[PDB]
Symmetry: D2
Subunit: 330 residues, 4 copies
């Protein structure tokens, strides 16, 4: 054989990848997560899983054809979860997605049912993985993945408000003529309608925007900064109406979180985690708060100082999620 | 205003971009080119142009929402070509795309008519740009864009066989257990059915695969390496049959060419250029040959030493393209 | 010729050129950091020591296969610097063991009287990025000699002091420095100002959880973090003889904002006359918006009376030195 | 404490580095390797080792102060090898360096004595490490590291001719007006005076330069391409004469090898390995040949087809290296 005339083999290697990432779901979200991760050189192996055989195979082949331009030596796919074995990070993007005008909370039963099959299959092949939930409603589905997996809470993460906060920083950046990297602001709670903008922490170079404008984010704000939060809430609905779905921004948001996990950065991200014991919350509610994210997942939570109105809005987001969460059939 | 209390302006904002890229067409190919370019930090401004208003705005908005994770501070869109002003590179992806069982050659009348509108509008606003043609049939469309634009031939580049060669290299790599970066091989001629695998130049570490196996690429080959070229030819059709279209690999192949142009690398790529005067070709045929690509586009053409059968196959590819090209009216 | 048998030539100025003046440890660290961040299509090096200059250029050229900067050039002659978008000056006497950066001033001013007109002659529209010490005074000096408008004369200033501060804050908290926010302003030296009022994690003011933060009465003595920021260069000089790596990375950070027109905010040296309560033509670090045209805007930081007094003291210290200087 | 007021700890330590690199020696080569590795984001932890305490601490601190600009969250140092624990790769740059007019082969006795201390201390704390030898004479020192460590051959690599080949490609590129990435050519054998330019493999886009000029690399060559290999041989001495030492190009060459290892790329590099059994070599000689490099080090060797003259020059290099090997006192 030609391979043998050209090359002399020294050993049969173990082959087990050291930085493998699995993406579950090859829809628009899943593929945007896949491309972003490949262009960030985060993994030595990428695995894709879906239920539509043709689409899964087509997507895998199309990424594979770009291998020359990448540094991810192995790209694989299968409907069988054995393809996901030894993943460091498994990203779940599978399930029903919002239609035009549809609340993310409307996807709950359909996605809890899908998660009942997915989660035991992921766990079986990667018992030491970190789970990164992207499927919606993300907060409730992070709780679902946690309960099903049996994993400790540090290893079950939801993409949460990482994108909501990125959108907030982009809009603030556009209003001020400053790059979003130099605009600071936190959107917490549900990744949806009940999210909370933390006006007290909104700043550029550590200068509180609220110290210059005390009415910042209120109805009495002459510049109406609350419309920035309204744009954050409405963004996914506005994008879906225009292009039928969202993909690029969530893909970048997920690869940003994947980078912190894979590279053990210990950067702070507003992501879905259990908030039991914070702000008077007594139940197993999962929603976004600023978390320290690394190789072991969420190791710590930043206790944000909320005004009484900000805390009341966060407890409202918590009540909305727990109302659905507490009555789940699984 | 809050902005003025926070920031003291010391310079009048008369912003002109220095490394602007425009992507014409927001279909799956155009968006894969856009995300790949954004993630490679090649531009300081990205402009998108299309004819479907909603889809165009949705795509622009979705990219802008990922700005925090990028280093391209300005993302814009419009149906109006004034939005593309001062681009250094303009990437053309617009037009009809081949259906399952349809040749890229069959899109020619539809795409020439579209180019008659797009090309003059692009050159009107970006007099310094290089035109990077991606729409199909890419070889005939590069010739068409060249003739319409009034640009010199070095500045009108067709993505051509850069993707066929990357596909070939990936497949060769899979067979050998070597990264595509270390598997060398050139697929030239039409970016389509009549492409030519240059078996004589196929090598690993300077070792000719044809020297070890003389039957390489022929029907007599026991390992059937000709199936690698057949898979290269069939790849877009196979992927279209599986996922409905191709996007990722073409996106990365175009970003690869964009990097060589923007960074003036003078790397060699198999891309569409005028071959009149080479291999006895007498007509104004555009096809892929290894070209040196930099800040002024195609500055030089490498003269590949082809076996008598490889040369005849290349002249056959040229004849096929001329057969379609000679009947065009524009 | 082999080249003509292989290649058919069809077509017989760089667009993103950067020049580094000075091939000392600082200059070479700026050079490697810029090459490894793919910011330039052409890098030029300039120095007065011909052998050292050529050897550094050749050493960089030999790594060309692992880079994406296709032209690396050098000369003692400034004609090599023509068409630079950005010119970084790292040349002159460098900080010595147990000595203030203010002790290099007159010698570096005399050297800039030669360098600056030569840079200006070949790239009249470049952005000048001053790294040489004392950076705040030398930025003012380069501004005066060049005749450039103030937006195009930038000093590396406190970008490194703030980076050191965020690393030290990060080590105490167990958080990546990217998630630890806090600004060190004024002189890139002993009179720098830690802005405790803006120090935060996830928008949470550290002063809100420790009102005494940064003062003598602070039970956790966070003033020691700023003391570590001040002492850092002296400590590194004592141990290894000079500093190079952290400054090269800080300079490449500023070069990225300029070259990619990011409009990110950096604490860098700029003309502060009329701002923050200062009446003289003093340059010091304040948070600036940095892009393709250099410093376009200045962020007006809300400083506490203590912080404002310290910044005024830093301005007074620099003005005092600058006053008694000849050029 | 302020930390406890701001952060709730939820986990539980277990901080084991997953992609750790160690650099032994903090001279100019060791620091150029360190800065290049840091700027390529290859490691989650970087450890430095040396015998000069102040120099080592000052270098560590200077890298640490640049952390905000990096993605390697742990930079450590010590004269104690326990600091290198759990490294995936250990880079050895310690030892005497050659003076002008002094052969790298003259460093043998001083460097072997140093390796007798370093090697057992390195291997002790890192079960999974690959040993990457940079110190000179590199080929002899790779054999020495292999004998002292008791490691299998796949795990002991010498930086060998990776830099000689990069220099060759750079110089070829300069003559042809082509980027080094598109200029192919191998310099094999000893990383020193007896290296072998493989003219038969020298090519652009698969085109053999020797097939265009049969006299290529011989004294009969009108263009004297042999001067390119002479410049490769003399390059370290020319740089040493001008600036006192070489650092940047070797740092980049070592980071290139570290990238193939850390990311399991399976790219081909001309690096020091055992050649017993190839080209009639019957002894345990280490020298550069093209190797497939990945996570388990050198898993495979490319059997380059050499002309009788190239093979004779390669065996001559092996004989020279074997001669020095017979002088080793373990
Ligand atoms: C039992 C099941 N296992 C899977 C696995 C993958 C998918 N795939 C998607 O849901 C892709 C499209 N969805 C979005 N949101 O992109 C569906 C199912 S159902
Ligand atoms: C006169 C015209 N100008 C344009 C500009 C853009 C587009 N957009 C596409 O065709 C994108 C979808 N198609 C593919 N190939 O992705 C069509 C036209 S028609
Ligand atoms: C009239 C003059 N032009 C120059 C240009 C470069 C240099 N080079 C250095 O000073 C490098 C070493 N110094 C530090 N600080 O690294 C000195 C002079 S004097
Ligand atoms: C028993 C010993 N262990 C070590 C470890 C490191 C070093 N360090 C250097 O040799 C740095 C300077 N040399 C080069 N080549 O840069 C020397 C020794 S001696
Ligand atoms: O992936 C491929 O081979 C090519 O992809 C496309 C390139 C440009 C457009 Br517009 C549409 C498809 C092809 O179909 O030629
Ligand atoms: O530039 C080069 O070729 C090489 O550089 C070094 C390699 C290892 C050490 Br330790 C020091 C220098 C060489 O001298 O072999």
């Amino acid at each position: 054989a030609l391979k043998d005339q050209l090359i002399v083999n020294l050993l049969k290697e173990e082959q087990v990848p050291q930085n493998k990432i699995t993406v579950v779901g090859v829809g628009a979200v899943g593929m945007a997560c896949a491309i972003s991760i490949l262009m960030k050189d985060l993994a030595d192996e990428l695995a894709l899983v879906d239920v539509i055989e043709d689409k899964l195979k087509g997507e895998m082949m199309d990424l594979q054809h770009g291998s020359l331009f990448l540094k991810t030596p192995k790209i694989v796919s299968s409907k069988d979860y054995s393809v996901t074995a030894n993943s460091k990070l498994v990203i779940i993007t599978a399930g029903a997605r919002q239609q035009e005008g549809e609340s993310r909370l409307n996807l709950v039963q359909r996605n809890v049912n899908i998660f009942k099959f997915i989660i035991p299959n992921v766990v079986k092949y990667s018992p030491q993985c970190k789970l990164l939930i992207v499927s919606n409603p993300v907060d409730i589905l992070t709780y679902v993945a946690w309960k099903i997996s049996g994993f400790p809470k540090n290893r079950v993460i939801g993409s949460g408000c990482n994108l909501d906060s990125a959108r907030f920083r982009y809009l603030m950046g556009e209003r001020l003529g400053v790059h979003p990297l130099s605009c600071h602001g936190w959107v917490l709670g549900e990744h949806g309608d009940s999210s909370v903008p933390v006006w007290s922490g909104v700043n550029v170079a550590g200068v509180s925007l609220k110290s210059l404008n005390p009415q910042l984010g209120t109805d009495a704000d002459k510049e109406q900064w609350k419309d920035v939060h309204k744009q954050v809430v409405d963004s996914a609905y506005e994008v879906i109406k225009l292009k039928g779905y969202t993909s690029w921004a969530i893909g970048l948001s997920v690869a940003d979180l994947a980078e912190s996990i894979m590279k053990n950065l210990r950067r702070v991200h507003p992501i879905s985690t259990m908030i039991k014991g914070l702000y008077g919350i007594k139940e197993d509610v999962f929603l976004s708060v600023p978390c320290i994210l690394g190789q072991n997942g969420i190791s710590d939570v930043v206790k944000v100082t909320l005004t009484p109105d900000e805390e009341a809005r966060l407890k409202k987001s918590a009540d909305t999620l727990w109302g659905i969460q507490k009555e789940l059939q699984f």
